RNA sequence: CACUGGUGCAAAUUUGCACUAGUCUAAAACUCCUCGAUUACAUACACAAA
């Protein structure tokens, strides 16, 4: 079983070091950090700089090589602890670590203006580089996706759109570049560009991602339309600028200042999309929450009205019950399986989603108003468990606790959950005035437009998506406060100024704030899409449709164009099961809706996906899909089944649908939704899991760029280098300077000659030519482009990992129809004859990599790839 | 099945193993918030309708 750091359990957040003293901090509420002790690393002399209340650590002995400690809340009945004091280390002169890559310098340099003698601001520096990693995927993510949904499936050009828009043209100068004093070659330039956003616009698929065109043709409303999406698309490309370098080699330095410092009209587009979202939420929010809080005022008894609304706008858009230190859906779904199972019955499963808001607020607001000191003791049983055991214990023993508490309450919420009462609350008189929520409601002018400008993004991304970007952008902001928090306490007082391209920093607290409620309110559900005929065939398409079926037939078909009562049911259909899906909305935005549904042929590939469902939820779409089960065969036969049906799935076998079913045509109804919803599942499952693979190489590629940069500023070797001439110059130069010299600023190659020498062998086994094509085809999304054309090759699908390698090495050894005889790459012929991917070149690929060894070997062999992987074998 | 530090056995000139840590390693510091993830998520029961 894999146990946690004793140390981290006790309560011992971190020991940070200077020169001359060591700070050690304790765990307060969430990410905030107590103050314990100061240390001397040349006496050890301590001083307790935390109060008798706030103090969470007894310091023991210190000495040269270790820190005693122990708890004064009872952790291990308060054992003593031994961790090693940090400022000892063999070889090192200074008390102050390095970081492995040798950068920390240069780092303080560009972010505070000079070099610090305390490993505190590096800390700061690479929450900082985080940000920038995370972004540095999503920009590639959504670049990939607006080209893509150009539907220009033959094009060797990619960045021709994208690339040559600028946040510094205003919309005029966009629409009108001849009128502009800008060169010849960037008049050329804008015009490409606003050739391909027409093309965007023609395409009507913006639709998907709530980007609806105006209803009307009036000239003003469809400029205000296209301007909003303009900026937009100019602001991801300035995002993409900040994060990628160019031809020459150069980034723009300005992702932090840049959103104040453009027109005021790209601010006036980010001000309309929030306050789109937070006014529909806020219009008459009691009236729109109605049935809720009818139902809470009645049970909470202990509380007054205006207390329960202003707490359930917050459970509803602040979500203060994500901000309590352990999961409140996770102890309502204890109680439920423990002893409300019951509720878990079908006849819930229309209502759901309200009884457990009903459920969740009652435990909300018993650890957050009525009993906080329970919280308290709860994160500190948490904090203290060292297993995962060990926490679901704890989650079990304080479930059985809520039980006693909140049973009649449960009840009371399940006898109100019917349609009846919910008709019934519905049209009832609520007599509270909407103005009871003015001080709590959360407006578009309340946020910093860097906050808005991230809600902007949303618009681009899956659901999944924004939890990852957010939640990471989240834990980063709210790292980098506290850092300049301690940094700014009278016990450590260092400089910690930033430099003018990082002041955003500075309002660190504010953001974190923001980005939460930009987290939950980018989550919700946004108003559907009117269906256009570009969505119909997407949906007919991936469903399987004769491929010369025209525009007039599809409309025919669904009847687009015809006005009746009753004539749309297929059209309904289509728009509920398809349009409407995420996961159909997913592959659209990252596939083809033709190559998707060719890709489902191959059993192989979707039986590897089927394989990875749980054998419960096998059990439960095989029930739902096939309409005469044998329940009595084997789970395999059950998958093999499904296969099938997925690899003859077609829009025909949907075509009698009966949208209004009455009686037993819901039987028929109910199977073609779940055939359909499987189906996209198990595709959405395939191509996400690329997506997701190869945003890991794109981290790769930020990385490798931004640490060239870094290391040509100090590397005079690197001085006339251009990165994109040879991608392997940074690996093969600082492997070289481990080799002839004895200092080094690269710790990971210094330390282990056995890997070093590994990675010189696979830089030899690569070329500048396959690395730049590589780095090509990881930033141009290409193995999610052509999964269909090679897919198809693998003898055995057993991972995500082997797939995208098999389909990026046949990428990458294809010879172009257009171009000569190339120098054919040595792994071609055995990749051909093997149908599966070659491991040695995959390590000559990633060879760019190979100065940072852990992310180089993560990449290179598939049992390190992925965290959740190989647990019981780790 | 990683990387780095400390400690402890071993080991000449390869280092290896064990225990333990690390926000200054890797998509990677505790509790959260997330992901894996399919069972879904989502200010408005569901269904139908526009
Ligand atoms: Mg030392
Ligand atoms: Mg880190």
């Given at each position: 079983?894999?146990?946690?750091?004793?140390?981290?359990?006790?309560?011992?957040?971190?020991?940070?070091?200077?020169?001359?003293?060591?700070?050690?901090?304790?765990?307060?509420?969430?990410?905030?950090?107590?103050?314990?002790?100061?240390?001397?690393?040349?006496?050890?002399?301590?001083?307790?700089?935390?109060?008798?209340?706030?103090?969470?650590?007894?310091?023991?002995?210190?000495?040269?090589?270790?820190?005693?400690?122990?708890?004064?809340?009872?952790?291990?009945?308060?054992?003593?602890?031994?961790?090693?004091?940090?400022?000892?280390?063999?070889?090192?002169?200074?008390?102050?670590?390095?970081?492995?890559?040798?950068?920390?310098?240069?780092?303080?340099?560009?972010?505070?203006?000079?070099?610090?003698?305390?490993?505190?601001?590096?800390?700061?520096?690479?929450?900082?580089?985080?940000?920038?990693?995370?972004?540095?995927?999503?920009?590639?993510?959504?670049?990939?996706?607006?080209?893509?949904?150009?539907?220009?499936?033959?094009?060797?050009?990619?960045?021709?759109?994208?690339?040559?828009?600028?946040?510094?043209?205003?919309?005029?100068?966009?629409?009108?570049?001849?009128?502009?004093?800008?060169?010849?070659?960037?008049?050329?330039?804008?015009?490409?560009?606003?050739?391909?956003?027409?093309?965007?616009?023609?395409?009507?698929?913006?639709?998907?991602?709530?980007?609806?065109?105006?209803?009307?043709?009036?000239?003003?409303?469809?400029?205000?339309?296209?301007?909003?999406?303009?900026?937009?698309?100019?602001?991801?490309?300035?995002?993409?600028?900040?994060?990628?370098?160019?031809?020459?080699?150069?980034?723009?330095?300005?992702?932090?200042?840049?959103?104040?410092?453009?027109?005021?009209?790209?601010?006036?587009?980010?001000?309309?999309?929030?306050?789109?979202?937070?006014?529909?939420?806020?219009?008459?929010?009691?009236?729109?929450?109605?049935?809720?809080?009818?139902?809470?005022?009645?049970?909470?008894?202990?509380?007054?009205?205006?207390?329960?609304?202003?707490?359930?706008?917050?459970?509803?858009?602040?979500?203060?019950?994500?901000?309590?230190?352990?999961?409140?859906?996770?102890?309502?779904?204890?109680?439920?399986?423990?002893?409300?199972?019951?509720?878990?019955?079908?006849?819930?499963?229309?209502?759901?989603?309200?009884?457990?808001?009903?459920?969740?607020?009652?435990?909300?607001?018993?650890?957050?108003?009525?009993?906080?000191?329970?919280?308290?003791?709860?994160?500190?049983?948490?904090?203290?468990?060292?297993?995962?055991?060990?926490?679901?214990?704890?989650?079990?023993?304080?479930?059985?606790?809520?039980?006693?508490?909140?049973?009649?309450?449960?009840?009371?919420?399940?006898?109100?959950?019917?349609?009846?009462?919910?008709?019934?609350?519905?049209?009832?008189?609520?007599?509270?005035?909407?103005?009871?929520?003015?001080?709590?409601?959360?407006?578009?002018?309340?946020?910093?437009?860097?906050?808005?400008?991230?809600?902007?993004?949303?618009?681009?991304?899956?659901?999944?998506?924004?939890?990852?970007?957010?939640?990471?952008?989240?834990?980063?902001?709210?790292?980098?406060?506290?850092?300049?928090?301690?940094?700014?306490?009278?016990?450590?007082?260092?400089?910690?100024?930033?430099?003018?391209?990082?002041?955003?920093?500075?309002?660190?607290?504010?953001?974190?704030?923001?980005?939460?409620?930009?987290?939950?309110?980018?989550?919700?559900?946004?108003?559907?899409?009117?269906?256009?005929?570009?969505?119909?065939?997407?949906?007919?398409?991936?469903?399987?449709?004769?491929?010369?079926?025209?525009?007039?037939?599809?409309?025919?078909?669904?009847?687009?164009?015809?006005?009746?009562?009753?004539?749309?049911?297929?059209?309904?259909?289509?728009?509920?099961?398809?349009?409407?899906?995420?996961?159909?909305?997913?592959?659209?935005?990252?596939?083809?809706?033709?190559?998707?549904?060719?890709?489902?042929?191959?059993?192989?590939?979707?039986?590897?996906?089927?394989?990875?469902?749980?054998?419960?939820?096998?059990?439960?779409?095989?029930?739902?899909?096939?309409?005469?089960?044998?329940?009595?065969?084997?789970?395999?036969?059950?998958?093999?089944?499904?296969?099938?049906?997925?690899?003859?799935?077609?829009?025909?076998?949907?075509?009698?649908?009966?949208?209004?079913?009455?009686?037993?045509?819901?039987?028929?109804?109910?199977?073609?939704?779940?055939?359909?919803?499987?189906?996209?599942?198990?595709?959405?499952?395939?191509?996400?899991?690329?997506?997701?693979?190869?945003?890991?190489?794109?981290?790769?590629?930020?990385?490798?760029?931004?640490?060239?940069?870094?290391?040509?500023?100090?590397?005079?070797?690197?001085?006339?280098?251009?990165?994109?001439?040879?991608?392997?110059?940074?690996?093969?130069?600082?492997?070289?300077?481990?080799?002839?010299?004895?200092?080094?600023?690269?710790?990971?190659?210094?330390?282990?000659?056995?890997?070093?020498?590994?990675?010189?062998?696979?830089?030899?086994?690569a070329d500048?030519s396959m690395?730049?094509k590589?780095?090509?085809?990881?930033?141009?999304?290409?193995?999610?482009?052509?999964?269909?054309?090679?897919?198809?090759?693998?003898?055995?699908?057993?991972?995500?990992?082997?797939?995208?390698?098999?389909?990026?090495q046949?990428?990458i050894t294809?010879?172009?129809?257009?171009?000569?005889?190339e120098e054919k790459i040595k792994y071609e012929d055995?990749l051909?004859?093997?149908?599966?991917?070659?491991?040695?070149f995959?390590?000559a690929?990633?060879?760019?990599?190979?100065?940072?060894?852990?992310?180089?070997?993560?990449?290179?062999?598939?049992?390190?790839?992925?965290?959740?992987?190989?647990?019981?074998?780790?």
């Amino acid at each position: 079983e894999k146990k946690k750091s004793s140390v981290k359990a006790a309560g011992m957040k971190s020991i940070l070091v200077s020169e001359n003293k060591m700070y050690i901090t304790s765990f307060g509420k969430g990410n905030s950090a107590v103050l314990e002790y100061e240390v001397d690393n040349n006496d050890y002399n301590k001083t307790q700089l935390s109060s008798k209340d706030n103090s969470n650590i007894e310091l023991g002995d210190v000495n040269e090589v270790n820190i005693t400690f122990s708890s004064k809340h009872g952790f291990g009945s308060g054992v003593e602890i031994n961790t090693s004091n940090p400022t000892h280390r063999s070889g090192e002169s200074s008390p102050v670590r390095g970081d492995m890559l040798g950068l920390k310098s240069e780092l303080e340099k560009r972010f505070f203006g000079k070099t610090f003698d305390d490993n505190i601001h590096i800390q700061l520096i690479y929450n900082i580089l985080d940000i920038e990693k995370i972004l540095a995927v999503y920009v590639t993510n959504i670049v990939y996706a607006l080209n893509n949904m150009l539907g220009i499936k033959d094009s060797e050009s990619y960045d021709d759109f994208m690339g040559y828009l600028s946040a510094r043209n205003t919309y005029e100068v966009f629409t009108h570049p001849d009128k502009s004093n800008l060169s010849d070659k960037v008049k050329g330039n804008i015009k490409k560009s606003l050739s391909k956003f027409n093309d965007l616009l023609k395409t009507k698929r913006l639709g998907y991602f709530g980007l609806e065109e105006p209803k009307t043709k009036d000239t003003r409303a469809s400029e205000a339309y296209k301007k909003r999406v303009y900026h937009m698309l100019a602001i991801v490309g300035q995002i993409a600028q900040c994060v990628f370098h160019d031809k020459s080699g150069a980034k723009r330095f300005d992702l932090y200042s840049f959103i104040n410092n453009i027109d005021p009209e790209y601010r006036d587009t980010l001000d309309y999309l929030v306050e789109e979202r937070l006014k529909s939420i806020n219009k008459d929010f009691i009236e729109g929450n109605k049935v809720n809080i009818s139902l809470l005022i009645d049970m909470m008894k202990g509380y007054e009205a205006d207390d329960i609304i202003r707490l359930y706008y917050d459970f509803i858009v602040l979500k203060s019950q994500k901000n309590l230190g352990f999961s409140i859906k996770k102890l309502r779904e204890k109680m439920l399986e423990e002893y409300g199972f019951r509720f878990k019955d079908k006849q819930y499963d229309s209502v759901r989603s309200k009884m457990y808001k009903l459920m969740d607020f009652l435990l909300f607001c018993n650890y957050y108003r009525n009993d906080v000191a329970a919280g308290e003791a709860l994160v500190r049983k948490l904090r203290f468990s060292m297993t995962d055991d060990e926490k679901e214990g704890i989650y079990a023993d304080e479930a059985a606790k809520l039980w006693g508490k909140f049973r009649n309450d449960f009840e009371n919420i399940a006898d109100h959950m019917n349609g009846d009462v919910i008709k019934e609350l519905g049209k009832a008189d609520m007599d509270f005035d909407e103005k009871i929520l003015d001080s709590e409601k959360k407006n578009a002018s309340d946020l910093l437009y860097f906050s808005k400008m991230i809600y902007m993004l949303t618009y681009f991304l899956d659901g999944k998506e924004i939890n990852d970007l957010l939640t990471t952008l989240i834990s980063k902001f709210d790292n980098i406060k506290e850092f300049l928090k301690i940094m700014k306490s009278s016990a450590v007082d260092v400089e910690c100024e930033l430099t003018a391209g990082y002041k955003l920093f500075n309002d660190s607290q504010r953001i974190t704030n923001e980005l939460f409620i930009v987290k939950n309110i980018a989550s919700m559900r946004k108003p559907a899409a009117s269906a256009k005929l570009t969505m119909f065939r997407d949906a007919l398409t991936i469903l399987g449709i004769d491929d010369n079926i025209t525009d007039d037939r599809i409309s025919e078909i669904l009847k687009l164009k015809e006005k009746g009562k009753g004539i749309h049911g297929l059209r309904n259909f289509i728009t509920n099961n398809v349009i409407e899906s995420s996961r159909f909305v997913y592959l659209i935005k990252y596939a083809n809706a033709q190559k998707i549904r060719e890709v489902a042929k191959n059993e192989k590939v979707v039986m590897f996906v089927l394989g990875g469902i749980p054998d419960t939820q096998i059990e439960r779409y095989y029930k739902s899909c096939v309409e005469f089960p044998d329940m009595n065969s084997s789970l395999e036969a059950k998958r093999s089944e499904l296969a099938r049906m997925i690899k003859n799935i077609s829009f025909d076998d949907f075509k009698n649908v009966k949208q209004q079913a009455k009686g037993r045509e819901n039987v028929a109804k109910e199977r073609a939704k779940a055939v359909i919803g499987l189906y996209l599942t198990v595709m959405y499952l395939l191509v996400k899991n690329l997506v997701n693979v190869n945003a890991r190489y794109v981290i790769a590629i930020h990385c490798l760029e931004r640490d060239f940069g870094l290391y040509k500023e100090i590397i005079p070797e690197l001085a006339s280098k251009n990165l994109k001439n040879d991608y392997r110059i940074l690996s093969q130069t600082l492997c070289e300077l481990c080799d002839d010299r004895n200092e080094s600023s690269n710790l990971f190659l210094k330390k282990n000659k056995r890997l070093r020498k590994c990675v010189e062998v696979d830089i030899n086994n690569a070329d500048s030519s396959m690395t730049r094509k590589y780095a090509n085809c990881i930033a141009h999304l290409t193995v999610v482009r052509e999964l269909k054309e090679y897919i198809g090759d693998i003898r055995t699908v057993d991972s995500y990992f082997s797939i995208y390698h098999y389909v990026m090495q046949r990428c990458i050894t294809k010879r172009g129809d257009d171009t000569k005889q190339e120098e054919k790459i040595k792994y071609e012929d055995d990749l051909l004859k093997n149908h599966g991917y070659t491991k040695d070149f995959v390590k000559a690929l990633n060879s760019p990599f190979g100065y940072n060894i852990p992310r180089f070997k993560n990449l290179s062999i598939e049992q390190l790839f992925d965290r959740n992987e190989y647990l019981t074998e780790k």
